[PDB]
């Protein structure tokens, strides 16, 4: 399945996941893509922060969702 | 000094705050304003999230400034 994950700054990120991937997964999966490490990101769903344990399907995450990122950098 | 808290859910809050309050300062001025625990948020300017002991004029966020708000939810 198809989700957006769109950053604050503009770009779109297209990824192909999985329904089940845990929220760890798509971080995986945009450090392959994008190479933004995992550590580095907060994804967010309908204006709440996601957790890494969770998968897509628990937070009813479906085909073509949007999906946001927000980075978590050292020093504010 | 005016500036703009954007939910990531299509709400804009409009703020007074002083270039030199710190981020937890701001949490606590939207709380007053939307009764949001300062706990439950997490504030973003330009793609990243702030840390709360350092000041809005630290991330150089001046006056007409945007910044965006996502909660960090848990309980129940």
Redesign the interface.
């Known amino acids: 399945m198809q989700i957006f994950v769109k950053?604050?700054?503009g770009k779109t990120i297209t990824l192909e996941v999985e329904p089940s991937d845990t929220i760890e997964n798509v971080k995986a999966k945009i450090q392959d893509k994008e190479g933004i490490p995992p550590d580095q990101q907060?994804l967010?769903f309908?204006?709440?922060?996601l957790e890494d344990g969770r998968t897509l399907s628990d937070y009813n995450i479906q085909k073509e969702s949007t999906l946001?990122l927000?980075?978590?950098?050292r020093?504010?």
């Open positions: 950053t604050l700054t907060r967010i309908a204006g709440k922060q946001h927000v980075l978590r950098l020093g504010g």
